[PDB]
Design a protein around this nucleic acid. Structure first.
Lengths: 150, 123, 218, 129, 88
RNA sequence: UAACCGUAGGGGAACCUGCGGUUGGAUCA
RNA sequence: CGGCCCCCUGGACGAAGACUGACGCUCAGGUGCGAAAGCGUGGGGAGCAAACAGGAUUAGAUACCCUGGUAGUCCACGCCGUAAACGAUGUCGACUUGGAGGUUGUGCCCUUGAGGCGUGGCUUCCGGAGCUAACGCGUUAAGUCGACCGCCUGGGGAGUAC
RNA sequence: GUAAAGCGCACGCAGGCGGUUUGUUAAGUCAGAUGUGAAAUCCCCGGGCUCAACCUGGGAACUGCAUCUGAUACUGGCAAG
């Protein structure tokens, strides 16, 4: 089953001839407690209409993390835009240690024990992907033997 | 910088500036009250608030805010400064303790008794 | 001394500071594309296509350019795959959802002439409806067989098919493009520094692509 | 380089990888080849040789598994003006153990595990993941 | 710069062998000449700075060489500084 | 009266004028 | 830093080469060089032109415009050290696709040619990977690295006061 | 680069950094060991006050300084290149 999660939703505006219009956005992360995720971002003139698009766009264009025992293989590190995120795996017992976006993106990827931190900009739109890119690089302890075994 | 540039002139601190003349590292300070004003707030807000110059025990004079829905101080009454500045009122970065020394305390207040001057109502 | 002796160089001093480690060495107006830095790319890319072709995936050859349109199908259509030799629509990789809708009226449009269902309505009407085929069967006629986003996109020139590549790196669809001196290879995950032009350069490699892909799936 | 010949080795290797190069070449050195020998057994590099009995020139062969390359991480640490010397109980563990860490010991050039298995320490050289 | 009948001349006076235009003993001494000779030039004009920049160059460049000798053969240093009336 | 920097002089006040540099100048100058 | 000529002089680059043998890179403090305006003494003074004086414009016009015009602009010698002193991008070195062009050296090619093929220096424009907040930078990097130095830590107050 | 930030530019003393090889040294460095690093705090395991706070045994640690015996890859010194 896919587990969607509404990160947050801003309004945003646009001034024009007549006056000025508005269009909420919203960001959503989806995934399963196995090892797959992928955020979504859609706009709309309605609070609900927006999240509708982001979700759809979320289910598609996912990803597959090399998770191990409900955590990361090693302390990966990813960044995007002005967001600097560093994630580190922890033994069973420690819940998901993360702020906003990160805390969410992981609570659906199948992460159970971690402890990250957003260094750069706390922008959700980025810190959400700065994390995904991290796991997207997560080198699993497997294949490595083949990457240089022969 | 670089290790070398650091070995010479490392990383300087920053003398934290504690916005408070009645320092002496105290929770509060005793005063005397020079007078009772009713100055007006800034540009965003209106309505005249109540204030008063205080002649702190350490000489350091300063005007303190007299919060509460009911003033009752005199031009000689002894009050106790606490802290917590006030925006609308510039230079007024203090407040007179409610229910202490020769001051009074809000009347008929039944909510947030701790703050202001009230201790267990008419039951 | 092999066939790789036709795309030596192209695009004068306009170049692009990024495309440098692949320049044999400027000479006589334009520069040259170091083929020795092209040999690995010559197969490394094809290797993945050959590997992915075995997974029974999809491959879309983008080449809106005239000198590559008519001469691209034989490498894609004939080889039975995917290609767009015309104006790459806006969203045929991201907004596919609504785009596919156009494909339908194209398919059902085809069936019209198929049977006697073509001799319907005034003789003039058929004409007004047949025009849609010209456009449809052209801008989509070579992608209709794509019942879902591909798994890898191989575009000719990385410049012209700009938008094409864009949407790709936004969906997660790998891209194998044969850039060029004035090209921006930062959008290609599998660069092939070769003459984006040269009637021969295009054909050889283009056909060479379908080659590995053909038997890619054994 | 003319000041950091060892730091150059890593750079030339990583710069080659990015450009999907085949083999990297540069002036040899006792320590250089010594380092190049480790990455060999570690499967990070195909093979490696040299030319010149008076004018030696190292010859390394890059490596890559699939679409991406193998050596996708290679940085230095114990550089001049900021050298690093660890003990048998301080040695680093690149990528939680997956990646290796070259370290010169009184026995010779080794890896984070190598020297540790021995029970001795040395001047760290670089991190290879 | 300097005249060949002079440059190729001096070289055969400090060189520990023949045509050793490299030898510090040589090169170094070769610098003093073009330096002393220019001092008469700079005495005039003066304002000619762009030429002194090169003058200073060969001066420091000469010193960079003297320090070397001292750090390669103490003798040769004091053995050459005299033949050139250096140190002043 | 393109603006700004330097420097100089002048004027109720922004600022005006001269000399040099800049593009952080619009229109095909 | 632009006319032509002579005299004294510095640096850059190429090529066969021959020679020295790490003698190198950076550099707080230090020394020196610094547009223009300005300053001192003495020269010079066509044109231009702060000041200043008329005329005009305007509600006003201590301006723009017009008629004049002094310092100054020029020379020598000494001083002042600033500029959006700008690539707003420290110096040195090694790597990393390409395209078109400019300028200068050299090797070579029926050198039969304007010419054609290389191989160095410096330099324009486009641009790939990558980098970037974006603009954009892109082998002359703002990409990947290493050595040393200068510098930044919210706006105003203030590059001001002492 | 444009957000605060490359000195207007050079030369250069002190300082920092230093191409390649062999020998040598063993100062840095690494290994072992001997001192010492007060006790109490902290931490681990375990005891006693009905529990806890608290009290308490042993260890761990005290990342350091010195000395001795080594090891010689790298940095440094010396010699010849």
């Amino acid at each position: 089953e896919l587990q969607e999660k509404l990160i947050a939703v801003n309004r945003v505006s646009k001034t024009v001839k007549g006056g000025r219009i508005f269009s909420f956005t919203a960001l959503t992360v989806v995934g399963d407690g196995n090892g797959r995720v992928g955020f979504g971002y859609g706009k709309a003139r309605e609070v609900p209409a927006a999240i509708q698009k982001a979700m759809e766009k979320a289910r598609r264009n996912m990803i597959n993390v090399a998770l191990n025992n409900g955590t990361l293989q090693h302390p990966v590190k990813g960044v995007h835009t002005g967001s600097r995120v560093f994630m580190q795996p922890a033994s069973e017992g420690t819940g998901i240690i993360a702020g906003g976006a990160m805390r969410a993106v992981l609570e659906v990827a199948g992460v159970h024990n971690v402890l990250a931190k957003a260094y750069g900009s706390t922008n959700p739109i980025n810190v959400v992907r700065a994390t995904i890119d991290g796991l997207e690089n997560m080198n699993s302890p497997e294949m490595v033997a083949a990457k240089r075994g022969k | 910088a670089t290790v070398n540039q650091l070995v010479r002139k490392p990383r300087a601190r920053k003398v934290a500036k504690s916005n408070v003349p009645a320092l002496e590292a105290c929770p509060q300070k005793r005063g005397v009250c020079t007078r009772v004003y009713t100055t007006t707030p800034k540009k965003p807000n209106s309505a005249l608030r109540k204030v008063c110059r205080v002649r702190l025990t350490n000489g350091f004079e300063v005007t303190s805010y007299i919060g509460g829905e009911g003033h009752n101080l005199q031009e000689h009454s002894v009050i106790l400064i606490r802290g917590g500045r006030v925006k609308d009122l510039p230079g007024v970065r203090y407040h007179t303790v409610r229910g202490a020394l020769d001051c009074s305390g809000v009347k008929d207040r039944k909510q947030a008794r701790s703050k202001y001057g009230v201790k267990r109502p008419k039951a | 001394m092999l066939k790789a002796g036709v795309h030596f160089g192209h695009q004068t001093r306009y170049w692009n500071p990024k495309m440098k480690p692949f320049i044999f060495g400027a000479r006589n107006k334009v520069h040259i594309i170091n083929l020795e830095k092209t040999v690995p790319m010559f197969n490394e890319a094809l290797a993945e296509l050959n590997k992915i072709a075995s997974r029974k995936g999809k491959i879309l050859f983008v080449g809106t350019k005239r000198a590559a349109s008519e001469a691209v199908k034989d490498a894609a259509l004939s080889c039975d795959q995917f290609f767009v030799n015309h104006r790459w629509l806006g969203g045929m990789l991201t907004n596919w959802k609504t785009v596919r809708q156009s494909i339908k009226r194209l398919k059902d449009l085809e069936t019209q002439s198929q049977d006697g269902t073509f001799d319907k309505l005034t003789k003039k009407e058929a004409l007004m409806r047949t025009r849609e085929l010209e456009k449809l069967e052209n801008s989509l006629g070579g992608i209709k067989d794509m019942g879902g986003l591909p798994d890898a996109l191989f575009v000719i020139d990385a410049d012209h098919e700009h938008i094409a590549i864009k949407e790709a790196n936004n969906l997660g669809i790998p891209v194998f493009a044969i850039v060029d001196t004035n090209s921006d290879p930062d959008g290609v995950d599998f660069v092939i520094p070769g003459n984006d032009d040269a009637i021969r350069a295009v054909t050889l490699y283009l056909g060479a692509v379908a080659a590995t892909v053909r038997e890619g799936r054994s | 380089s003319m000041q950091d010949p060892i730091a150059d080795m890593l750079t030339r290797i990583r710069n080659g990888q990015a450009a999907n190069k085949a083999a990297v070449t540069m002036p040899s050195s006792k320590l250089k080849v010594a380092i190049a020998n480790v990455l060999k057994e570690e499967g990070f590099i195909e093979d490696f040789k040299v030319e010149g009995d008076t004018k030696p020139e190292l010859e390394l062969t890059l490596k890559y598994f699939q679409g991406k390359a193998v050596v996708e991480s290679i940085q230095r640490v114990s550089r001049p003006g900021l050298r690093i010397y660890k003990r048998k109980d301080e040695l680093p563990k690149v990528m939680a153990g997956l990646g290796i860490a070259v370290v010169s010991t009184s026995k010779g050039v080794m890896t984070d595990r190598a020297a540790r298995q021995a029970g001795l320490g040395g001047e760290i050289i670089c991190y290879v993941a | 710069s300097l005249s060949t009948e002079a440059t190729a001349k001096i070289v055969s006076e400090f060189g520990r062998d023949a045509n050793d235009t490299g030898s510090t003993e040589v090169q170094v001494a070769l610098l003093t000449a073009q330096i002393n000779h220019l001092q008469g030039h700079f005495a005039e004009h003066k304002k000619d700075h762009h030429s002194r920049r090169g003058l200073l160059r060969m001066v420091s460049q000469r010193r960079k060489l003297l320090d070397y000798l001292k750090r390669k053969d103490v003798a040769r240093y004091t053995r050459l500084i005299e033949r050139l009336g250096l140190r002043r």
